[PDB]
Amino acid sequence: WEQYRDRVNMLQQERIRDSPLLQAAKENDLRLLKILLLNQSCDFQQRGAVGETALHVAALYDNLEAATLLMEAAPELAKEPALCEPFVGQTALHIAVMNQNLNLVRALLARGASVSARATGAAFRRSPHNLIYYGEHPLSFAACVGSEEIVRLLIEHGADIRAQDSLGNTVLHILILQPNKTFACQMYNLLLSYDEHQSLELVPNHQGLTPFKLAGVEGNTVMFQHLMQKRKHVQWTCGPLTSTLYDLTEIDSWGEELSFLELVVSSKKREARQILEQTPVKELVSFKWKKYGRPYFCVLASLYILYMICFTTCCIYRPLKLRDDNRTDPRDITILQQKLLQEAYVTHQDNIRLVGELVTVTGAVIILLLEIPDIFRVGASRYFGQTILGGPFHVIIITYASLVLLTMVMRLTNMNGEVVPLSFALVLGWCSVMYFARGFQMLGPFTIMIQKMIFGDLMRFCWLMAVVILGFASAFHITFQTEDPNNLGEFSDYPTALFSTFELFLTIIDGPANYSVDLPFMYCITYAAFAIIATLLMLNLFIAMMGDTHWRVAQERDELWRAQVVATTVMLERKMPRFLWPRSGICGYEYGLGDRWFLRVENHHD
Amino acid sequence: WEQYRDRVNMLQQERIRDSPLLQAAKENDLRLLKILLLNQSCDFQQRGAVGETALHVAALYDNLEAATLLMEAAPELAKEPALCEPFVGQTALHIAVMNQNLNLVRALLARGASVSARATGAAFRRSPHNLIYYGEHPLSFAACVGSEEIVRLLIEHGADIRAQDSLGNTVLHILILQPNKTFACQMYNLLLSYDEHQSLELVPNHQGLTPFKLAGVEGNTVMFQHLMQKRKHVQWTCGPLTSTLYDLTEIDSWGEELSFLELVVSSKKREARQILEQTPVKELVSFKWKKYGRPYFCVLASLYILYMICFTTCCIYRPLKLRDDNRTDPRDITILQQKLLQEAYVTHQDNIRLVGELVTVTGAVIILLLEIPDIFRVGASRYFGQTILGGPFHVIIITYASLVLLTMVMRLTNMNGEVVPLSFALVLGWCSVMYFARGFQMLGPFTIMIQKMIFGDLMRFCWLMAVVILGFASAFHITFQTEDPNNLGEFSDYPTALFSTFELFLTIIDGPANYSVDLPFMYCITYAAFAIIATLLMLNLFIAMMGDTHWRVAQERDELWRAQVVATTVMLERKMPRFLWPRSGICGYEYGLGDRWFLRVENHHD
Numbered sequence A, B: 001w002e003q004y005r006d007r008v009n010m011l012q013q014e015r016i017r018d019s020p021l022l023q024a025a026k027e028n029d030l031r032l033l034k035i036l037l038l039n040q041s042c043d044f045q046q047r048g049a050v051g052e053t054a055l056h057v058a059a060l061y062d063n064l065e066a067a068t069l070l071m072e073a074a075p076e077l078a079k080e081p082a083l084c085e086p087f088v089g090q091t092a093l094h095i096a097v098m099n100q101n102l103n104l105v106r107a108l109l110a111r112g113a114s115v116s117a118r119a120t121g122a123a124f125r126r127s128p129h130n131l132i133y134y135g136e137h138p139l140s141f142a143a144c145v146g147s148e149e150i151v152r153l154l155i156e157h158g159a160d161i162r163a164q165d166s167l168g169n170t171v172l173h174i175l176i177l178q179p180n181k182t183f184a185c186q187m188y189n190l191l192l193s194y195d196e197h198q199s200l201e202l203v204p205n206h207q208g209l210t211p212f213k214l215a216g217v218e219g220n221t222v223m224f225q226h227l228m229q230k231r232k233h234v235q236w237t238c239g240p241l242t243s244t245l246y247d248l249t250e251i252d253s254w255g256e257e258l259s260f261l262e263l264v265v266s267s268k269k270r271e272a273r274q275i276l277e278q279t280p281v282k283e284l285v286s287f288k289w290k291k292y293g294r295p296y297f298c299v300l301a302s303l304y305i306l307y308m309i310c311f312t313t314c315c316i317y318r319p320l321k322l323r324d325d326n327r328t329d330p331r332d333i334t335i336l337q338q339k340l341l342q343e344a345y346v347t348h349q350d351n352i353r354l355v356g357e358l359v360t361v362t363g364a365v366i367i368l369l370l371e372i373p374d375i376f377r378v379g380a381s382r383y384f385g386q387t388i389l390g391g392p393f394h395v396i397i398i399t400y401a402s403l404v405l406l407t408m409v410m411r412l413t414n415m416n417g418e419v420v421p422l423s424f425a426l427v428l429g430w431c432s433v434m435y436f437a438r439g440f441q442m443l444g445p446f447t448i449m450i451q452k453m454i455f456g457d458l459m460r461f462c463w464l465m466a467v468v469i470l471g472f473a474s475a476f477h478i479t480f481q482t483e484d485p486n487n488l489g490e491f492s493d494y495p496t497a498l499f500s501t502f503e504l505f506l507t508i509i510d511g512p513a514n515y516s517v518d519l520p521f522m523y524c525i526t527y528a529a530f531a532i533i534a535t536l537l538m539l540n541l542f543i544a545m546m547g548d549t550h551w552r553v554a555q556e557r558d559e560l561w562r563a564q565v566v567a568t569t570v571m572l573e574r575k576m577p578r579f580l581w582p583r584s585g586i587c588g589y590e591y592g593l594g595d596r597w598f599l600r601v602e603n604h605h606d
């Protein structure tokens, strides 16, 4: 919380200003320090608002002379951490390491400061409130700051590299969480040494993620390249061609429930889809999509198209009988009604329709059985909210299967009004065939564009279009509230006025004009203003805004598709049986390389 | 095949690892090499998985000491090539030349390695599988790698420059197939020397292509400029103006069936149309198009317009009599029927129509006789698939002539239903006048744009538009399946519902609204959703996507037109008689320069 941290910092500065020892440590006033340390009544264990000692104040402002004088007067201040909530466990060693004062780190380790001291405070935890997540240990702080000398000095004094914070992250995870991504590779190389023998790269955090999986999730492409440099083998370099043998143990993740590629495509980070364009991963998912993914996706698309054709044919031949009542109202045009269940299935065509409806119900049950456990598997927000995983289509097909089952219930219980679920089910089921458009390059990015336009410019257009219809519907209704509805029936009731002016916004119906009668002049004025500001201005400004936001998000539209084709492969590999999806790569047991599976990439390095 | 090559490379590395001599040659372990070559039981002719010797392994990893020790123990390993399928014929000289080890090439030639050894393997042939096509000879390998010293050393030892691989390419063709295009000119200059006397530049491959024609086909513009540098003569350089005299022997290609420009404009390469913008070729095709091409294309366009006017006038005056049956059905509006052939031609106007129909049939026969042999001449895929040659228009006019002949057959055999071929023939014949739009700058690029939009954004729009119509047609049909069809007949049958909602997608008909009756509320909900997602969203998103893909392919649209005007000249020169197309250039026999035809270009070099 921002105001709490502002109060904490203000109170900390007030205690510093209201304590002569803390002010002398801050301003490096050595004379006042000698006077205060000469007096025995002055407490060496004075604590500030955050529980900081005077040594913490000396290390905070890089006053080496003040810190050495305080440690000469009281060495045990090196062993005293802070004890208040935003800075629980922070010692002077943490602040000395953060400020990169190597002589101060030497002086603190000389006095016996704890090299395993853990700063379990709210300011040192990973949070959107905190601006840096450098860990909880001085070794993690020195690794994330970027000082190799302090790292070597802490390791020589007994710092444990295999130390986990409150999130379970080791020093490698917090190194991969840094946004620098350049010196962190050098610090990763430094900390891979002294880990001589489970290695530190195989230690998962509390989310179960290895540093390889964490680099895949967080979208650290440079750290991913640095990690594969250690997981490759150059076979030959004859001429301009070289053949490298990447290891797919930590990429393919055979047997693991949450594989590497599944964590990559389901990650919320925008850089996380830039891991799919790297040298082993792109070749692996490209081999999987061409060899196995695309034919299986095409036959599933054909099966879903045939299923929707059967559902549509069952909707066309829906059992309707003549009405058993007279049409007294002259504005009532209903001549047919739904049959009861006893009379619905009598003829042979009704038996064929019964077979098709059983096929439809079985398909809806299959759709629900495929869709429901994945919501609990990957979370409700990530399943329905990510474009790469097919977010809106899962909501659409769950609504479609629910409406089909509701129509089955209404058919069995003889409820009237099956058109209301059936039209919704037809519209949602046929618009859910746009999922399979992600399997084709001609149709994938256009479908992603349609998704971006619907949740983007269409909603912000509709919010103002609603206030224009609500104005002009009321105006058009009250101008025609004193006129005969038979001559101009476009605005005769307020719902009809709303629908008529909504159609007049999009110019899908003609302007109401009866030239044999005398319309009000207020209709002419209001409709001229409506034609100016809605038809001419906003309906063309929507085209202009779509054209402006098409080229801005065009590059983002192609990348999101290339990822959508890595999530279709990573699902089909998960959901389809194993005999249809053979293990990808080259088996090392055939060639004596071991029990590992490799991928061979031959590239022209010139 | 990728998996076969992965298996081959893995098996090759496994044999290297399972053989002590091959592993010693790979790792350059000279002590183990001395131990193994001391033992007589160790076979010097050990072969790997690809049939490679230990000398091949030594040359593969640039181990010069290992290779010299192996050749000291066994010189005849220099004469032993590999004998397995991916690497048939590859010797150690090929791998030494590929890795640019000049001392190893000296040591191999000293031992008597074959300088004419031909590597007829699948890895050395031109293929999309292979990443490099460097030829099949060590001289071709040294030329394509870029080492002049190795080229001179191989030529001094007896390499044949006039050597052809399995594709018939000499060393110059494989030099022109390199994507470097900069050092290949220097290597071309080097290999033009030692060819002192048919020269090497006049040797065709198995496709009949010279290096000049191959550089034209492959779009190598830098090599084309380097080749004309040797085919030009500077007459004078007075001031800032210079007059050069280019040779049109290998550019115009008089008498040759497959000329240079015909191979250039029919090539599938995208860079191949960048040869038409070079200094002799652009001036030659510009002179041909202005002097002869444009008036002939204009009079052919006028003749085709008059022919289509005659065909349209014959379709308007089509012989129709009154029906000889009563209209019992109230929804039947047919009042006229086709006349029989005996009563069709009675009056004088019918004789004028007979003359016009004979003109139409003769024109269709002429169109077929012009179009049919060119399909067999240039291939079916290249004739119907290339925008530069007029791809879709040939399919359109073949369909048009076929429909005209089908209408003639139906007229002679008294078949009923000539409207079905005649409307198709009229639509296709009038849309085939867009071919002649390539003869004009105002109409050419716009027609290429229309072609790019139809095969581009229009198809990807129509594939999703089809799933929107199939959804909303079914919804609109089942909402009106219980209503009287007389009040709202837009959705009364499923084909009529499909056509009505297809018209409602493009807003070419009004929204169905009868204000004197009570329509279903489900129609209002479904039509509001349809108006949002089809009329507002997708119909404007098509405009936005066309505007986005107009400026991206605008530069490509002008270049494709400039080429289309070089293919119209190269066809008209081929198809029209020779007395209408005089030979282009300046005759050298008039001025004593020889039996060659030249083009004079005067340019301001400042």
Ligand SMILES: CC(C)[C@@H](C)/C=C/[C@@H](C)[C@H]1CC[C@H]2C3=CC=C4C[C@@H](O)CC[C@]4(C)[C@H]3CC[C@]12C
Pocket: A392, A393, A396, A423, A424, A427, A428, A431, A432, A434, A447, A448, A450, A451, A452, A454, B525, B526, B529, B533
């Ligand atoms: C007639 C009723 C059912 C109303 C509610 C209509 C709703 C349909 C037509 C709308 C609701 C949400 C829309 C929708 C949701 C999101 C996407 C994902 C996008 O990448 C392609 C279009 C697509 C698939 C569209 C298609 C049309 C849908 C499914």
Ligand SMILES: CC(C)[C@@H](C)/C=C/[C@@H](C)[C@H]1CC[C@H]2C3=CC=C4C[C@@H](O)CC[C@]4(C)[C@H]3CC[C@]12C
Pocket: A462, A463, A465, A466, A469, A495, A496, A498, A499, A502, B520, B521, B524, B525, B528, B532
């Ligand atoms: C402008 C945006 C917000 C889009 C969504 C507009 C929607 C509004 C204007 C549309 C959508 C559905 C329409 C609608 C639904 C159904 C009926 C029942 C019918 O018997 C009278 C009209 C009536 C009452 C209209 C009123 C106007 C509505 C509510």
Ligand SMILES: CC(C)[C@@H](C)/C=C/[C@@H](C)[C@H]1CC[C@H]2C3=CC=C4C[C@@H](O)CC[C@]4(C)[C@H]3CC[C@]12C
Pocket: B392, B393, B396, B423, B424, B427, B428, B431, B432, B434, B447, B448, B450, B451, B452, B454
């Ligand atoms: C009424 C029937 C005949 C249906 C099939 C209509 C087809 C016509 C209208 C369509 C089919 C393919 C279309 C077509 C093909 C390709 C091209 C090349 C392009 O550079 C200009 C437009 C042009 C020439 C268009 C014109 C319109 C055509 C010829």
Ligand SMILES: CC(C)[C@@H](C)/C=C/[C@@H](C)[C@H]1CC[C@H]2C3=CC=C4C[C@@H](O)CC[C@]4(C)[C@H]3CC[C@]12C
Pocket: B462, B463, B465, B466, B469, B495, B496, B498, B499, B502
């Ligand atoms: C959305 C894209 C795919 C474009 C091409 C749409 C085409 C469809 C919707 C159109 C094209 C031709 C139309 C068509 C052809 C002819 C007839 C016969 C007529 O008596 C009833 C309507 C009917 C059956 C309609 C149905 C809808 C069709 C098939």
